Structure 1
Amino acid sequence: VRRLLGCLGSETRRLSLFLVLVVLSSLGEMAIPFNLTLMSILTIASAVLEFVGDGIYNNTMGHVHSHLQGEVFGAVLRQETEFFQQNQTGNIMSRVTEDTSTLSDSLSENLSLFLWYLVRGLCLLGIMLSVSLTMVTLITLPLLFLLPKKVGKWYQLLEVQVRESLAKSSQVAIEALSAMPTVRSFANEEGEAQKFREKLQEIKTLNQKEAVAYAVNSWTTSISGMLLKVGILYIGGQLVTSGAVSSGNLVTFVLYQMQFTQAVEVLLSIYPRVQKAVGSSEKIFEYLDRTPRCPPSGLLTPLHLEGLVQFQDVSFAYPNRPDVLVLQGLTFTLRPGEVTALVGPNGSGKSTVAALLQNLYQPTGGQLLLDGKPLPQYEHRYLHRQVAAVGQEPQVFGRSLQENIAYGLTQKPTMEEITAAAVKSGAHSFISGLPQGYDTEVDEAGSQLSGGQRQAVALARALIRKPCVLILDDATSALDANSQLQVEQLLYESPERYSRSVLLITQHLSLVEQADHILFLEGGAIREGGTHQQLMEKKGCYWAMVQAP
């Protein structure tokens, strides 16, 4: 239950400057009432107290909120890649945003209520001190803790499924919204509405039990307080006949007794809210304490680097389906100033080789070396700056073109190299056509651009880092015959070709004739390897692929 002290104590200093004030108000209540402004000068002073407490406490609570949401999201980004496909996007959105918001508001209300009533209850206990009747009340008090102890676990188990179904409904909503042309082109809006209602049925089912649980809790709290009041008043009335104390002695003792019961039933009411918040902080605190299974960032940052890449007996298996092995026996070498073209049928695993080269995953039974050193040894930023790739499906984010091209660079290159990289990739030939120049805005997922424009923007983004290892993977799929020769120049006519190691994965057989090396990958195994003429002279699978038409 007390899992919050590790994420609140850093603010407690400010809370100290609240807590003293709390008793500065509490003794205001305990003090007896002791000149036409005599009722004024005190009263507005009390109002000033009502400005200094909640003026400060709220100023701390936001610092608890905006920090915590800055941490949990960070705990999302440290996890491994295969986590992000095990948990859907909508689930991560829901657990990042609304669970944290609900926990923060629940804490911000319940902490203030708990303090402001515990101090008053302690003062009310202190002021009434016959010792014997007070001790009788204090021994019958801890009997009432038996039922919320059995109620809190039910509350946690009930609220966890509420959060799960809300997250699933949000995932359905965002998946329906993010693919709107595909939804409308098949006329399947009613299916998405049906899926949303099917998700909301579980929420209604759990809420109809939440209401009953709240009603039973209020019933038990009021019944327990009432019965204890009748018990203490009865035993007092029976003790009156044996003398005990005077009428005026007990006429205030019973009043302080019912005030103490009023103080304690509020804590009895807020115990289930504490249990509900504890249940609400379940999936979030799993994200914070989860150990990422990927290796951490390295520390080497060599000032001089060559594009020497070695694959030695690399075998990989996807963690979703670990009983199969996608890659069996990869072993090859990439040198600077050379072009290696990796070709094969669909389902071979060329994108898996690209993912292994970019340190997205880890090999199962092999060695991958960059300049004689393993990939996790290098620093994360330096490694992803020295290795650049395009990918089969490029993605562009919703900002300016000059920020999409220079994305991820902390150095912040100026205008000149941005324009040079846009000219080199051929993107500038339409970028100057836009009315706002390079400062134009493109929306989410690049819906304002065509396929060739998106591929050109991705290529210009990958070019501007001046990488030593470059991976092109179907970068010429959507490009026409006019722009693609630029890519061909980028492979064979640019003077910077000697400074890069290019890994080309294309199904266009025109670009692989001039490659220094050609690899044929089928079933996760290298079938043929050599130059173009050596493969053409011998009879093999590459010859069949060429001579198929």
Structure 2
Amino acid sequence: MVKKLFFILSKEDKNFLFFLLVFSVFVSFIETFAISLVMPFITLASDFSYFDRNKYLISLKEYLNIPVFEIIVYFGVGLIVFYVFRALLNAYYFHLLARFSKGRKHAIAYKVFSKFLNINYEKFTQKNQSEILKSITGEVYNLSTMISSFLLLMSEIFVVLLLYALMLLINYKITLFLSIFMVLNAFILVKILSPIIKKAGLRREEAMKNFFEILNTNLNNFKFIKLKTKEDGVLSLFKAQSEAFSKANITNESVAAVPRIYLEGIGFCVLVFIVVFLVLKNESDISGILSTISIFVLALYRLMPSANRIITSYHDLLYYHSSLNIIYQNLRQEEENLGEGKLSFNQELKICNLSFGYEGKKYLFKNLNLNIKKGEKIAFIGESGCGKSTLVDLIIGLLKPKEGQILIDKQELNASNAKNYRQKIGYIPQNIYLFNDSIAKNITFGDAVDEEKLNKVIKQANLEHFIKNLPQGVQTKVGDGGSNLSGGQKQRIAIARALYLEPEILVLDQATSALDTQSEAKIMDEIYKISKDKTMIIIAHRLSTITQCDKVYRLEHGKLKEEK
């Protein structure tokens, strides 16, 4: 199950991962350094003696660039250099945690998306973009965030270990005491107060509900009240409920405050307790009294986040991780389509005993039979969801027929040539999705440009009077779908996009309703013109768009009739 993780992660990824591990432990040390360096600095900044015994300190003293006024000062400068240094080290560590997680999100998202773009058409189709978006987006977030969380978890569990070690070394007695005390407060808060608070909250809820209940009905009985004259009865009932509510409210609020108040007080108390019992055993009073206390204090506060991060991040390995890691293996060992080798289209697309059903699912056809002479311009009339869109989806490359054939010049369309067959159909979806970019792209669908092919295509789709009257011209961002674009231009742009692949079969998957019949008529006329040298299938939703079709088939549950 790490094999998963190291499969999903690249080489640079795995390396980066290990660097970040090491780095995590190293900052655990730099943390405990920052805490403990307070001990010697404070114990040597007072008392000034120490350079009067002890070989090392007096050796320093007799490096003589300074007396000791200036030695402690240099020591301070070294300390604030170190602390600045540590601030930088920590910033960089968190920045590298970000860099790792977000970079990995970028990489794994891209790998997953690619993986999806390669499954077969029905497979992609049969699940909702809600979930496919979740699959390449939310999951990748989870993995990323979680790995970073693990690294942070490491660094902090070592801060806890090292710091606890330090405390034990300096005064195992006190640290044992502080710890017993720690779990003691933990128990008091979480097992004695939290329940009382929670109840107080429920009491408040119920009392509020009841108060508002009879306030509301008293307001609803206003007419009956007004016809009594006297209002003392309801005011009575209301007073009683309002007192219940008020009371439960003052005690929920009262009890709520106890935990912080308790915390303030216990802090001071345990401090006094430490000095009153541990002034009975000393081992030198002086400034030393602050030396051993400060550490604990420091340590304790530094350990406060250590807890939280360790808790928080642990939860992140719970809620994410597990469920998620599999969802990559079982999403990127995902299988793709197939096929390679060509296929020619000069006579007819024959269909032959088609029959198709989606993976569920009773067939939509059974034994559909038709054929299309090259150039034929046909249309599929139908009762929408009767199967005509699916039919076209079979006639064009996508979707494997449950029973038919589909021959192209008497040659069977299948896995081996489907690439080359798919390659020869333009698409034109009427309700079109452009992406936010420079018209040229879309039209090219990314693929560089070709200026010439791009221009000839724009000319064909008669967008010429549009790309002339635009500021940036062919490079105008289209805002989204548009935003910058209106239906007619969107449509012509989609037509253009289709004509950039060029030939030889145009599908026109017209959407339902247009409320711009004039424009739809014009675009229809244009499309017919530009389908002169080509052959065209129309997934027709109207009629009146199909005036110029050589053939019209109506497909209804679940037979094909020729109409024309």
1:484, distance to aligned residue in structure 2 (A): 3.9
1:513-532 aligned at under 5 Å gives the runs 515=550, 518-526=552-560, 528-529=561-562
Q: Is 1:289 equivalent to 2:328 in the alignment?
A: yes
The alpha-carbon distance between structure 1 residues 42 and 483, as it changes in their structure 2 partners (threshold 3 A), is closer
Query: Partner residue of 2:97?
Result: 61
Report the counterpart of residue 190 of structure 1 in structure 2. none
Written as runs of structure 1 = structure 2, the 5 A alignment for 1:108-123 is 111=153, 114=156, 117-118=159-160, 120-123=162-165
Match of 1:313 among 339, 344, 354: 354
Question: CA-to-partner distance for each residue in 1:68-106, whole Å, 9 max, x for gaps?
Answer: 4425644467552343355598x8999589x76995899
Task: Give, in angstroms, the shift of residue 402 of structure 1.
Answer: 1.6
Cα distance per residue 1:454-482 (max 9 Å; x no partner) = 32221111111124443123399764655
Describe the shift of the 1:52–1:482 C-alpha distance in structure 2 as closer, same or farther (beyond 3 A): closer
Match for 2:356: what amino acid?
S
Q: Distance in 2 between matches of 1:333 and 1:293?
A: 39
Question: Does the 8 A contact of 2:351 with 2:371 survive in 1?
Answer: yes
**Take 2:429 and 2:451, find their aligned partners in 1: how far apart are those partners?**
26
What residue is the counterpart of 2:382 in the other structure? Answer: 344
Mapped to 2, the partners of 1:16 and 1:109 lie a distance apart of: 9
Residue 84 of structure 1 corresponds to which residue in structure 2?
Answer: 128
1:505 match:
539
> Counterpart of 1:393 in 2: which secondary structure?
coil
Alignment partner, residue 153 of structure 1 = none
Corresponding residue SS for 1:420: helix
Q: From the superposition, tell whether residues 479 and 56 of structure 1 become closer, same or farther in structure 2 (CA, over 3 Å).
A: same
Secondary structure in 2 matching 1:470: strand
Alignment size in residue pairs = 443
Counterpart residue identity of residue 520, structure 1: R
8 Å CA contact 1:512, 1:518 repeated in 2: no
Change (3 A) 1:504 1:400: same
* Structure 1 residue 53, shift from structure 2 partner: 1.0
- Partners of 1:395 and 1:446 within 8 A in 2: no
- Asked whether the 8 Å contact 2:351–2:369 carries over to 1, the reply is yes
The residue type paired with residue 273 of structure 1 is: T
2:469 is equivalent to residue 393 of structure 1: no
Give the aligned residue type for 1:56. Answer: Y
Match of 1:432 in 2: 468
- Residue type of the alignment partner of 1:316: G
Q: Provide Cα deviations, 1:25-57, integer angstroms capped at 9, x if missing partner.
A: 534544534622523541343145225413431
Query: Which residue of 1 is the match for residue 308 of structure 2?
Result: 269
Residue type of the alignment partner of 2:509: D
Instruction: Decide which structure has the larger Cα Rg and report it.
Output: 2
Question: Among 480, 490, 503, which residue is 1:444 paired with?
Answer: 480
Cα 1:523–1:268 change in 2 (3 A) is same
Q: What is aligned with 1:464?
A: 500
Q: Secondary structure at the match of 2:313?
A: helix
Residue aligning to 2:530? 490
Amino acid at match of 2:558: G
Maintained 8 Å contact 1:313/1:367: yes
- Within a 5 Å distance, the mapping from 1:173-252 to structure 2 comes to none
> How much identity, in percent, do the aligned residues show?
16
Structure 1's unaligned 5+ residue stretches are 151-211, 530-541
Deviation digits for residues 406-459 of structure 1 (CA, Å, limit 9, x no counterpart):
1143xx232111121122223324433445432334333234444333322211
1:369-388 → structure 2 map (5 Å cutoff)? 372-374=412-414, 385-388=423-426
Query: What is the letter of the counterpart of residue 297 of structure 1?
Result: E
Matches within 5 A, 1:127-142: 127-128=169-170
Matched-pair contact (CA < 8 Å) for 1:18–1:53: no
Structure 1: distance between partners of 2:344 and 2:387? 28
1:124 to 166, 182, 198: 166
TM-score by length of 2: 0.58
Inter-partner Cα distance in structure 1 for 2:392 and 2:263: 66
